[PDB]
Hints:
The structure holds ten protein chains of ten kinds. By secondary structure, chain D is mostly helical. Chain D has five domains: 1-21 and 28-33, no CATH class; 38-164, no CATH class; 165-293, no CATH class; 321-388 and 406-616, CATH 1.20.1130.10; 629-726. In chain D, 58% of the residues lie in helices and 3% in strands. Chain D has a three-stranded antiparallel sheet, with no helix packed on it. In chain D, strands 4-5 form a two-stranded antiparallel sheet. A two-stranded antiparallel sheet of chain D has the order 6-7. In chain D, a hairpin with a 2-residue loop joins strand 2 (102-105) and strand 3 (108-112). In chain D, helix 8 runs antiparallel to helix 11 (264-281), helix 15 runs antiparallel to helix 27 and helix 19 (504-530) packs antiparallel against helix 21 (562-592). The longest helix of chain D has 36 residues, at 167-202. Chain D is globular, with a radius of gyration of 29 Å. By secondary structure, chain G is mainly α. Chain G is rod-shaped, with a radius of gyration of 14 Å. The longest helix of chain G is centred in the middle third of the chain and has 25 residues, at 5-29. Chain G is built from one helix and no strands. Chain J has one domain. Helices cover 0% and strands 28% of the residues of chain J. Chain J contains no helices and four strands. Chain J has strands spanning 6-8, 20-26, 35-38, 56-57. In chain J, 24% of the residues are buried. The chains are: A mainly alpha, B alpha+beta, C mainly alpha, D mainly alpha, E mainly alpha, F mainly alpha, G mainly alpha, H mainly alpha, I mainly beta, J mainly beta. The interface between D and E is large, with 80 and 84 residues. The complex binds iron/sulfur cluster (SF4) (3 copies). One iron/sulfur cluster sits between chains D (548-549, 551-552, 556-558, 695) and E (484-485, 487-488, 492-494, 628). One iron/sulfur cluster (SF4) sits between chains D (548-549, 551-552, 556-558, 695) and E (484-485, 487-488, 492-494, 628). Chain E: Its EC number is 1.97.1.12. Chain E: The chain crosses the membrane at residues 48-67, 132-154, 175-196, 302-323, 343-363, 502-522, 571-591, 633-656.
Amino acid sequence: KHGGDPLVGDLATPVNSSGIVKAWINNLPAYRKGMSANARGLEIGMAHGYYLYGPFATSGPIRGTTMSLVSGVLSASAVVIVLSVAIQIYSSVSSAKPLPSVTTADPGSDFGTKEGWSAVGSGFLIGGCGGAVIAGVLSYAIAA
Amino acid sequence: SHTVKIYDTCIGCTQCVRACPTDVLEMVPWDGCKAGQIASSPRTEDCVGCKRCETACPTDFLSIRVYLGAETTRSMGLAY
Amino acid sequence: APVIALVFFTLTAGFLVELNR
Amino acid sequence: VAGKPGHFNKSLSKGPQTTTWIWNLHALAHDFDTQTNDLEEISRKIFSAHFGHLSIIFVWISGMIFHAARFSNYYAWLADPLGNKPSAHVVWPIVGQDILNADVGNGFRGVQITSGLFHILRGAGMTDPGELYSAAIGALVAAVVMMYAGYYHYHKKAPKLEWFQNAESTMTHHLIVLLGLGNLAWTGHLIHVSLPVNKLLDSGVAPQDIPIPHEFLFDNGFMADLYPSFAQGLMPYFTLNWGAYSDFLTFKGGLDPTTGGLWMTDIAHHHLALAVMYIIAGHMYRTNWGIGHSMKEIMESHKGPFTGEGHKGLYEVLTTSWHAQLAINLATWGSFSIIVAHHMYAMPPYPYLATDYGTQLNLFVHHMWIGGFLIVGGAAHAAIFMVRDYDPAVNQNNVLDRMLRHRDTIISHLNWVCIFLGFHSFGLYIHNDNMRSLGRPQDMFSDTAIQLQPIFSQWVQNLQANVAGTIRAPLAEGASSLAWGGDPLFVGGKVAMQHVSLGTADFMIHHIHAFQIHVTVLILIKGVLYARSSRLIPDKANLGFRFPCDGPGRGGTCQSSGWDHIFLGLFWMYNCISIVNFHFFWKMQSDVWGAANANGGVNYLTAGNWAQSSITINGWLRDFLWAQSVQVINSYGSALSAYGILFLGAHFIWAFSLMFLFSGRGYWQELIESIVWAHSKLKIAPAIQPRAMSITQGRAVGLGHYLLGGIVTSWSFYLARILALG
Amino acid sequence: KFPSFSQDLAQDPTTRRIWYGIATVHDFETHDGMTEENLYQKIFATHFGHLSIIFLWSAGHLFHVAWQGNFEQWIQDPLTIRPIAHAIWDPHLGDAATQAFTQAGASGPVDLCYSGLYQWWYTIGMRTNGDLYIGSVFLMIVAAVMLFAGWLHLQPKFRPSLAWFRDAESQMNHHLAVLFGASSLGWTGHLIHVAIPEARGQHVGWDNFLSTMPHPAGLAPFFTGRWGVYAQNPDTAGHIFGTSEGAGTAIITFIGGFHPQTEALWLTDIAHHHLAIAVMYIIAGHMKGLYDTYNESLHFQLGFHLAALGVITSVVAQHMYSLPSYAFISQDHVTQAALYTHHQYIAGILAIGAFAHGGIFFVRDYDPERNKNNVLARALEHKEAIISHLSWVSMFSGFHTLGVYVHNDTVVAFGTPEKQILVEPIFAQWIQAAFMSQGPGDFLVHHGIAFSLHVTVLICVKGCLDARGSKLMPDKKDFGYSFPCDGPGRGGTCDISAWDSFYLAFFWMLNTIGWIVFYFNWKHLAIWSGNEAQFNTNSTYLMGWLRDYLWGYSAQLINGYTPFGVNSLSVWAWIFLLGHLCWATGFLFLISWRGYWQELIETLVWAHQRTPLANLVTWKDKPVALSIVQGRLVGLVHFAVGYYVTYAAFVIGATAPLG
Amino acid sequence: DILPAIMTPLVVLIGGGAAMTAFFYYVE
Amino acid sequence: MELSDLQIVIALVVALLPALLALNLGSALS
Amino acid sequence: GGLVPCSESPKFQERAAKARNTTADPNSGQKRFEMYSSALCGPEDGLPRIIAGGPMRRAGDFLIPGLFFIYIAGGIGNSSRNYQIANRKKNAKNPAMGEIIID
Amino acid sequence: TLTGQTPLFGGSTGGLLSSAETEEKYAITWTSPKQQVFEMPTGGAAVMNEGENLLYLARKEQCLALGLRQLRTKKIMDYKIYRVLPDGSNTLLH
Amino acid sequence: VQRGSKVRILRPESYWFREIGTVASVDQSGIKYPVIVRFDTCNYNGISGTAAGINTNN
Ligand code: SF4
Ligand code: SF4
Ligand code: SF4
């Protein structure tokens, strides 16, 4: 369907205007309602860092030996550092308030202010580092 | 924004006005021409610098002329 | 065009017959 | 009667003033859509042009039969196919070109040719000079007949507009009479002429002792001797006893171990079944009796929840617009050509063709090039249709409307796919380059290191190679081709077909092909979709299909039309086809083709280095381009020197195309102004005012010389290498 | 706010602001609120900056070669030991490459010196690592002094006035006298006092030159006659460099010739030469409108200086191998070829820069009335005739030359090489009789170079002359030096500005120098390998080049890494491949133009704006495709970089295994 | 004399990161 | 003939000074 | 020139001992050798050499081909000019037709 | 003050964007003597209804092209173009 | 300057600077360029691809 207004460049296709996909997207930590920016940053950091640990320790130059997991943890932590630097330098320029869309009727207000972005990045850094170290220790423990 | 000035040598053939895609040009009376009217540009800030008016002008050499200068969001045709 | 084609044909035939012997 | 140049256009017959007039007359000559507004005249002109082109094709076929009958060693090759070689171009002994006559064998001299003409002639069993001369004369007569028909159907009996739009009747006649009966007649010719001739030739009797098919048709006992089942002169056709035809209508499905070609009986039942199916299926459209299907009733009823109106209104646009039909036919024709190229080398359909490597290579790559060009043509003419014949009134909420509505999503997702494919397909090659260059050979993407096996293709090969005798194909004798898998069946002294193995390199190469194909598709589909109107230029349709730009405003709008998009996409099509051809050439030399060895092995041409060399860019640059050019660069002072000469000339022409691609027309116009001033100073200024050529035709000229140079370069390389290797 | 030195760009919402701000950082004339005195002061400081950068570059040279080099071992054997430049530290390297990169008797991965710095330092007096280290330290000190002076001469108290700068004749005379004569005299003094005694075998340093004895005359005849006493005993034919065998006592001679061992000029002759230069300059220092228009426009001065620099750079490139001046450099071919190619390409770029900045002067600073009926207005009034005569000579030299090549090619191809067209280089043979051996190929190549040279001159002068105006646009002066076009009207006006003429001429410059270096390298490789008949009998037809030089000598370079192993030329093969790649990647900007990419970027903008988890992040500036001039410029840069990298990789890959 | 390992990763990685972030601050 | 640590360190501490002067000059220029 | 005549060159004779033919007559290349024996051939490549220095005794190598070409080019150029003057404004006032179709 | 009805349409991705609601947005109004289909510069074909009409477009050039190359040939020379500020205040440009 | 007389164009920015033209009509209006001239040659005016030109100028 047109999705609110046909004149706007949008379409209410079942891909993104379905009830289940709308609930799933609006319940994500970036879009969920009722939490502070720090919790959003924390959950996003843990999720993406726990992702990022894998490939570094799997396909690394020392993938065969036991140092592969340490290398993967270190690389994931470094990538989290880089992304946190990106967030802290993006928050300074004071970008614009994101607008409501078809999937999200009421976007969060935590990403429209400098302090909100700074808190999100602060949570993201800790989340990523914790996820990487947790993945490393878990993968070591499982092997015994 | 772009700047457009019209020299006093055009015959007032009016093709430049009807060739402009943003209606930057308009026609005003002017006794200096045999046709009694000369082109005017009251919305030079809306000009996109497409140089269609220069193509439309038959007078040699180009009584109308468009100079590309500072470009804003209006002059660059940004829809986003 | 056809006149040009026939003229160039005649001159190239002349060149080839000159180089034949 | 016709000495009035520019008459076909309103703004061309007034009188030349500049050379742009000449160039436009050349460009707008055959653009019938601009010369008139009536549709009946356009249809008549299309009909006449069709007949003229048919006459051209017939003249070409007549010339080929003529030159193969007169100046060829066809009979000597027919007597001993494995000893002699096909030959034509008996060059005149002149200033220096007499050396090009190679020693094709057994005393005869001339240029060895690889167009498969002799294989086609042997397929029809033509083994007599009178037969060939009669065929040539008949082809000339046919060409004259079609030319006169083109004259008659336009100047004397011009059809009407309503006649052309009979889509159902058109399909019924053109599918039954032209196609099914044509295939039936060809199958009859096969079974009644060619099969006995090929059987006699395989018997090794003589090339000239074969009686004319006159006696074949007059007699019945001859084929009874040749075919035991043919003795039933009163054939049990109505008796339905078709099982008594298992002698010349078989389903062997393989390769003949004597000539290295498809089984003739297989081809017989094949074309016969196709003729029967076409005859059966051509009776489906309502012509004039009210019985059968009809276009709109079956096309308008296939709607859906997503696609809204479905195919409502497409019949009108497809019956009132020539360009859409041209685009569809062109795309399908190019796809058919590529399919032919793919399916011909796997199953050699002519006798003594698999052994001849040069002919197989040339046909493969040539028909691939044709397919690519025709596909690009389909895309282009679709763009013309969208910019010219599009009608909002007939198209609303139907297919085309919703296509134009979610075009932005299409382009975005297609671009993302193109970028992802480019990275994860070419970064693999660059990554392999770095890993091998750093002395770390255990980190490459190869068989000796972390490997990317093409498991799906291996599974499909396993399924297709062992399908004979199963439930789906119980009567099949063998696998459709040895390419799926099989012991190398080598005839003469060289391998005719073998199992084309698959691995990491082949996976990477097929995924490179996918990357380039989706990229070219992105270019063409973006041009087609945005040819009408975009955000940048809201009224792009009114500018036309072929315009150079829209001024320097809006930040610069160079190369925005659909013609510009087609010009950009032609380069990418060239790149994709060149990569495909390189893949095929190296793969065959390294895995398939070769000479049989006595100890059970096969002496491959390139010693099987495809596995360890075709995974790095430097690997290509060394083992293929630098290595296989030894034959072409040393061809001088020999019978293959022409290939080296054309190699150099093609590099030169490709380097010349940059002169038009890399520059603009303002500088050239100023230089031409200075030059015409110089000519005028001596009062020899031409009346036609010299003018620098337009932007669009400059781009077209650069593109044309570019494609010429690249294609001739590749062609000379392939021919020199494969002819010198033998 | 960036760029702060503008207002039009500061209000540009799109990303074009960044590109155009970076584009005109050093366009000091166009900054808003700029005065001439500020212009000259900033120019002074910036020249100090470039000088300091050069000095620090040389200091890094010296320090790195002193720390990680093998100077002493190479001194002990300047023939069978390859100099090294800087040790290799790359974590991404493998073990096999690490083992294969240990060469020249080193103790790890090191990269070789292909610039002949070792020989130059040996000739001037360097004999130990301590000297090199002290030189590097002194260079850093002088660079720091230069930087501090650049900062200091900007302070309000020490800021020079515009009137001081306006004395262009006075500063130019002071330059030509002092900066040349005094510097040459000082270098000659260094030579005589240290370098020649160092060559003779006796150690001389900063702690000994005060009490050392350069010549028994003891400077007495320098103020009187009997100057011939300075050359009473030159060196000996059997004299060994760096040894007292046959060492003479002369310091200023004019013997000429080549040393029997080092195969270079005599140090005494070089000292004599720089002394004659110094005295001539010292003597000459005290002693219509063109000579004043030169002092009126900055760009005229810049163009003249660049043209002179390019000409003298070509002269240096020719002489450095015609007359080698460094010991043990004629037995090391690779560095000789590299230096020749390098300064030749530099000379070409300098000449093109002269032409471009001259066109800039014509656009900006030219005045009709003040330059009325001078040597300059005559060229502008008769541009058409000179352009026409250039076109005639270009086509006359090109048509017939290409015909000769292709005719020889096709005649040889048909197996009858006894009927080609061979024209002897008679004038070169006459001048040599009244160097190397020249045949038909050398004749043809010199003629082809002349053809391409006149062609490049044609484009350059056409752009310079039509920069002010033309028939298509009689008001090109008002449109500035660089602008995209004038729209599709009047038949289309793509690629019209004088900047575009520079754009066009760059490719022809590249082709000309490429032909020059191809010729030089092929002849020298034929000579060095002991096979000269190859060049003589295989350079008449164009096919011989492809199958002999390009294909023939790119056989071991292309084998840098193989499925069997890795050798020492792996990095050069990688650079070769990167060279073809970087040349190819410019074709995108050369061929495809902006509008298609702008539409694509608009589509991408829509895609970004309508996706979850990404609308939260928005661009500060609206993305747009690169402008037309930006596309041309970036394509040209990629093209030139790929060309240079490819040929350098080929040169070292082909010449290094030979030696 | 193990300054390579201490210096090259530093001056490359941290140097480029600092330069890039400083320039990003500069253009806004 | 091989450079010991002391000269490397003193060379580096000399090299610090031109860095500071260059930074000051750049700041003064703009 | 500093070269030897091709007749006295031994390796030129050796090269001439083995050659291909152009005309169908078997003795079509050898006669080309005796035609080329009047020139001078170096002792490295053994090929005829064309002198551009304009000697009195060797004027036929380059001077007379140049005269032949300049005569031919002048003839065709003058013919084109004569056709242009005789088929322009002075003849038909509409020379556009006179350039697209010619007599 | 910009009174009218939106012509019938199914919704397309070529319409307004985020910057339309923040910096600027343009509107075009006209009256129709009947109901008929017409092409829009944002892609696809819409069916304008009887009487008044109101269309919102991102760029002035789009509205002018729609009113010049399409509305003129439909014998409709009574189209007004408005420049609509984000706050809600509007001005007439034609 | 009368109808049917040849003139030489002195305007430097014109396409026909220093070539002969023939006058076609002169009026007594107040415009600064009342003379009209017909030229045998056509100017550059027109979009790219056009095969015509303008032979008249004030
Ligand atoms: S097109 Fe030119 S001559 Fe005509 S009215 Fe406009 S400015 Fe005047
Ligand atoms: S350049 Fe285009 S938008 Fe500007 S005034 Fe001329 S026609 Fe109108
Ligand atoms: S450079 Fe050429 S194509 Fe591009 S805007 Fe200008 S006239 Fe048009």
